[PDB]
Structure 1
Amino acid sequence: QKTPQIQVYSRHPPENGKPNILNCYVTQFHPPHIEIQMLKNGKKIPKVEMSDMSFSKDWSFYILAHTEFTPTETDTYACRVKHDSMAEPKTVYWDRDM
């Protein structure tokens, strides 16, 4: 059992009001079964695109979750990850500066 590493980030540099793509890149986990949600303001975004399962040369699995989004100064965004290695779901919020 390996703990997932998460990165939440945008495809393009973010500008308020401009449509963009928000990515959740989950990495370094095992077993392959995992559950990923993406939240706007704390509520689940309905149409979340999942990439197909892959793994790296170190055997660990990785996956990209992504959604359409138009960021604003008020709205927050997050990725919720559920995995056998973690007691509780880990949520990591989007930081424009990272």
Structure 2
Amino acid sequence: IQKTPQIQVYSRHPPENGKPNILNCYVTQFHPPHIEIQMLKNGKKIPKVEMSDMSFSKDWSFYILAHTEFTPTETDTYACRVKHDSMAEPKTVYWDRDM
């Protein structure tokens, strides 16, 4: 079992510049379990990040959540960079406010 992770980046509430929200990075469907997840703000590692909701599905692939409080700006960008055996180089997914 060598399954590549699916990285999904989203916020809890619809973004409104200035008002607090939460940015989530859900890494799912991956195996083996060893993984490296990092949340970035303007290309910089976000400090106090929270890892939660660790679980697995019926096919045994792993699911883990990365989240942190954040207040969006019309210009700040956020991204989630993940490292896993199934990939040569780290994969980074960017937060799309307009999805």
TM-score normalised according to structure 2 size:
0.96
* 1: CA distance, partners of 2:57 / 2:74: 36
Give 5+ residue unaligned stretches, structure 1: none
SS in 1 for 2:88: coil
Structure 1 runs of 4+ off > 6 angstroms?
A: none
Deviations 1:46-97 (A, max 9, x none): 0000015310112100001001100001100000100011100000000012
Shift of 1:34: 0.5
How many residue pairs were aligned? 98
* 2: CA distance, partners of 1:96 / 1:82: 24
Calculate the aligned-residue CA RMSD, in Å: 0.8
Contact map agreement 2:4 2:31 (CA 8 A) in 1: yes
Structure with a larger share of its residues in strand: 2
Contact map agreement 2:53 2:63 (CA 8 A) in 1: no
* 1: CA distance, partners of 2:48 / 2:82: 16
Contact map agreement 2:49 2:67 (CA 8 A) in 1: yes
Match of 2:50 in 1: 49
SS in 2 for 1:12: coil
Shift of 1:27: 0.5
* 1: CA distance, partners of 2:76 / 2:55: 32
